[PDB]
Symmetry: C5
Subunit: 214 residues, 5 copies
């Protein structure tokens, strides 16, 4: 049964080939082919809050899900391969960007996604973000409140739509011994209009109330 191993790999190498070098590179969404990306935020730590610049440093991971008929296949032609991991470079990925960011976002996780036979893609980049947020109040019972919104930078609402599965930011993995404890963190979808462009823009707005321990 090392022969069995060899087939499962002949097949995966074939599925991947037939997908990525047959009808090459899906060109991103268009008005005519809109795409909805599901966003979820696991907040792990509020690393730093610089009260003299009003920047705050978060480490989270952001879970992204979309679906593409172009990534669809029947397992029964690929030997019951239901899914597979691939390089995030190998496929179109959504350009989800933090709007109040103040340094380039730092990737903490491997650039790899998982594609399923229904053409559904899931991708979870863990990131360190520095964003505009005024920590005044972080040492009072009330704490301080901060927001940062995540959305497509280039695609409108007619091209990319966003939706969350839940309002509650995942705090189950929040670092126990963090300098700051979480009081609430909500992921909410929003529409904004910008002075650049006629169309609306979907973002998911992350709102975090927090304070120092003791």
């Amino acid at each position: 049964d090392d022969d069995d191993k060899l087939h499962s790999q002949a097949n995966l190498m074939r599925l991947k080939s037939d997908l990525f070098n047959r009808s090459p590179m899906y060109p991103g969404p268009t008005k005519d082919d809109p795409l909805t990306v599901t966003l979820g935020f696991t907040l792990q730590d509020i690393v730093k809050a610089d009260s003299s610049t009003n920047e705050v440093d978060l480490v989270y991971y952001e879970q992204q899900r979309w679906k593409l008929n172009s990534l669809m296949w029947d397992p029964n032609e690929y030997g019951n391969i239901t899914d597979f991991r691939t390089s995030a470079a190998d496929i179109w990925t959504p350009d989800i960007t933090a709007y109040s960011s103040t340094r380039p976002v730092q990737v903490l996780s491997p650039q790899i996604a998982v594609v399923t036979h229904d053409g559904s893609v899931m991708f979870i980049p863990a990131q360190r973000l520095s964003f505009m947020c005024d920590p005044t109040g972080v040492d009072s019972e009330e704490g301080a409140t901060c927001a940062v919104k995540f959305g497509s930078w280039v695609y409108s609402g007619f091209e990319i739509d966003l939706k969350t599965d839940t309002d509650q930011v995942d705090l189950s993995s929040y670092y126990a011994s963090s300098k700051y404890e979480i009081l609430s963190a909500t992921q909410t979808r929003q529409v904004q209009h910008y002075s650049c462009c006629p169309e609306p823009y979907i973002d998911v707005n992350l709102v975090v109330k927090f304070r120092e321990r003791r």
Copy 2:
């Protein structure tokens, strides 16, 4: 399903037919001058280091230009009016801050939008450290600083700049920033440099600011 398949067969076609045959339109020439429109939305003045006289801004810079070479007719492609593309896939203008003091930091996806008339728009969100003496930032008057943005390699006869208005966009300036803005103006300038015979256009960003109170 079916209709989706076509509008992507088309997009893959347009993209292909454009970027191949002239892989690289090779940039402007005196023969083929190009004007790029600049706008600045100021988001935040993060930091003002009075000990080094560096100031830190976070803004985004909106760039627009036009290229016959990116021109196409919607009816050739099933009414595709425009599309998103990688910023590496196309020629982009080399707009550089002149009094910058650290490499500019890109905060946005490197992607642009191309329209059927061959007009391109691109908006890099940037964090900039530039030369600026914040003395006065703690007085009613505040402190004034300037930093000029312009092509680094292309002259006025190759790239020209113009702004659609002189007021820097402050509608999205951070409400709880350490510094409040008093005025921010984007104005076109001509300078000459000791390096080169021809004139060089820059858009000069002028910002008066003071500490929030």
Copy 3:
């Protein structure tokens, strides 16, 4: 005279060619072809502990080992070459990622591995890591305790399995005059489940007890 050197080289260039550029795959692990990676940690220095952000900086090396039938050769027909060094780019390498990390990991070693005729691969990246770690207690007899877990970020337990050779993290090479002395450092295998995914995920958890030297 010197001709012998020339053969050993023709033959290494041949083995490498026949392996890499006459492919037959390696697409990474799948359920049908699971892979077990051996992890070992040599802890070199606790560089910094920042009490105000609850971040700690470690310098270690991470010894990885796996096996691949696809990298297997009969040395007889390659001038009796038993192994060779290759660029880590030139092969599939496991995506072993620190979960509590707070800045991207810093590579301190050459991006090179050694492959043996049995298809066994060993790769030891030296790294600087910053992770969520609360140093409170670092200046008491007891010291402070911190954990960081290392695992595949994208491959589950059905694709990648992890195993240590020993529970003892290697302190042989730990800096003598480091700001912090180690009181124990244990590498222990674990299974977690995550909100993202149906299947379990293996990680090796590094647990470090430390305090300020005298």
Copy 4:
């Protein structure tokens, strides 16, 4: 004129393709075929003088100019194209290096150079340099005084020679409101010798005298 821009381009695209793609790119100067770069500095600002490490940070741009015969063409064979801009990684560029630098040089500007028909090339990289410089006295009448030498790292005086246009640094762009006032800034050709190598090495010595701006 639609076509009068298609021709201009096809020519430039072909011109470039003739010089690099079709031509074997020039292997740097030799003792047998030497080369003179002409260096110039525009000093823009002394950003930081750190008297706890004796590092000073300058921001300046360095005008570089050399002539290559491999880079000559006939504007008659390319629709009268007297010159063009191209990326610095398409051509050979001199390795002019700061000798007393303490942090790898930071590029403030795009990596693009201008080539003219007679083969002359100009390159103006803008940079930030941390170099070894005791700033004691920077708060007195007479100020402090600092040197940093630029010159080829690898090529000696028989491969690369240096010229300046003038031994006055370009203070025309010095930041009027800089922490530091410039008192003098001179650039001078020099010959050194080092242990490594038997020939002499040519540098241009930048010497700044400055004080904290009253």
Copy 5:
């Protein structure tokens, strides 16, 4: 006259280089076919000693020297070309790495090496290194004392050997005005053994004894 002579000299060096790389190739040292690098340090400056992390930052240049068969030519087929400069990435270079480093080494110089007709290569990368080093006592008569060993990361004592030209580090270029005076600096050949692997590994041990100025 000279226009032709410099077109010949170039065509030969263009040819010679394309003879050595674009044909004839060298896959690093083997036990079969070993190699000795000769290391030498010119220490230039101790920039920073951070007593809060026990990190020291040196700025030095490292002279590397090895000899390769695959790199020999006869100047009479290549018009008396005794040597040439070429990019480090066109030839094999040793992976001499700092063992006690805390931050990835920073390259202060261009990556170009010199190859002579007898196959010998010289490569002098200039570097900024942060390494593990308790600087206590640095403000006393007797100062502090620190070691950092450089040596191959992957290659054993049977693939790469090391030798130094002298046990004295070059302080003839030490920054006369640095925050730290050097009291001694010696480079010493050493053999280590590690858990990971069976054979000896050779390093050169750099040992610096230093104090703050006055």
